[PDB]
């Protein structure tokens, strides 16, 4: 509780009693300090909580309290509007998402959920949780517990009866149970009909087989067929799988085989020279039109 200045002058930092003492940690070094109280021995025990002094007092006067609460640093004062605008922007996005989720739930699906607002709020939280790193089991509970909270707390602050809390908690339990077993998100945080994990595996295998047998892409109709197969793939594939499959099958330039590479016809795209280190000579590989996914 003491400081030191440019001139090595020692000065007290807090009110108290000045004591000269020797610290066993620093032999051959005299010390000066300020014990916070007369009955306190300054070389305070090492492993005991430090004796601090709050000093600052509470503002009982109403006007003084009002002034202090409405007094913020220039950083906070200048950042007040920008943060609020971003909050308004995100609130609007949440509102639009809630509207979109309700529309698809009632229209794309035909589930008769009694509580529109509760169901949407559970799902939007689940989506936000899923967007962030969270396994499906954790995401559903996290949203579930959140809703069941603000309800036990609401009961406490509004002095609700036990039965009211029980029915509300039960009501949340069923709506979440119905939503989990009847709704799901497909690789893009978009709501759609629930798909079982075992079915997901079955569909994934079928797509892999259906995509392997058709990898020549000779004619634009085949191109459409392959692309058509990549329409509901998001329902039973994770993003990592979806991107990997596209890279493997939707190749921009197909492998150079006899059909793909030929010089007999004219306007074979362009010369497209490369270098071979086996013969140490420049090579000319005139690609054919049926060698690029873009044109084919």
């Amino acid at each position: 509780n003491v400081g030191i200045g440019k001139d090595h002058s020692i000065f007290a930092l807090e009110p108290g009693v000045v004591r000269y003492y020797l610290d066993p940690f620093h032999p051959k070094r005299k010390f000066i300090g300020v014990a916070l109280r007369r009955d306190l021995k300054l070389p305070s025990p090492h492993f005991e909580p430090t004796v601090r002094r709050f000093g600052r007092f509470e503002l009982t006067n109403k006007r003084a309290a009002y002034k202090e609460e409405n007094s913020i640093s220039r950083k906070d004062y200048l950042a007040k509007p920008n943060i609020l605008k971003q909050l308004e922007v995100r609130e609007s996005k949440r509102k639009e998402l809630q509207d979109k989720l309700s529309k698809v739930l009632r229209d794309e699906l035909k589930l008769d959920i009694k509580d529109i607002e509760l169901a949407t709020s559970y799902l939007i939280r689940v989506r936000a949780s899923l967007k962030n790193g969270y396994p499906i089991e954790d995401a559903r509970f996290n949203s579930r517990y959140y809703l069941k909270e603000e309800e036990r707390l609401k009961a406490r602050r509004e002095s609700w009866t036990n039965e009211k809390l029980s029915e509300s908690l039960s009501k949340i339990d069923e709506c979440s149970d119905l939503l989990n077993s009847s709704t799901s998100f497909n690789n893009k945080l978009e709501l759609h009909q629930y798909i079982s994990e075992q079915e997901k595996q079955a569909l994934k295998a079928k797509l892999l087989e259906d995509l392997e047998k058709s990898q020549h892409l000779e004619t634009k109709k085949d191109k459409n067929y392959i692309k058509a197969l990549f329409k509901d793939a998001c329902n039973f594939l994770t993003l990592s799988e979806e991107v990997h499959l596209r890279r493997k099958y939707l190749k921009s330039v197909f492998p150079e085989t006899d059909s793909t590479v030929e010089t007999k016809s004219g306007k074979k795209s362009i010369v497209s020279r490369r270098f071979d280190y086996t013969k140490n000579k420049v090579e000319v590989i005139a690609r054919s039109r049926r060698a690029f996914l873009s044109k084919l």
């Binding site: 000093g55 600052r56 007092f57 503002l59 202090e68 406490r156 602050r157």
Partner: peptide, 17 residues
């Protein structure tokens, strides 16, 4: 505070005395 139904917090000074 209001969410947890607690008394409003106290407001202190900006200086120690």
């Amino acid at each position: 505070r209001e969410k947890y139904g607690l008394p409003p917090g106290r407001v202190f000074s900006r200086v120690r005395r």
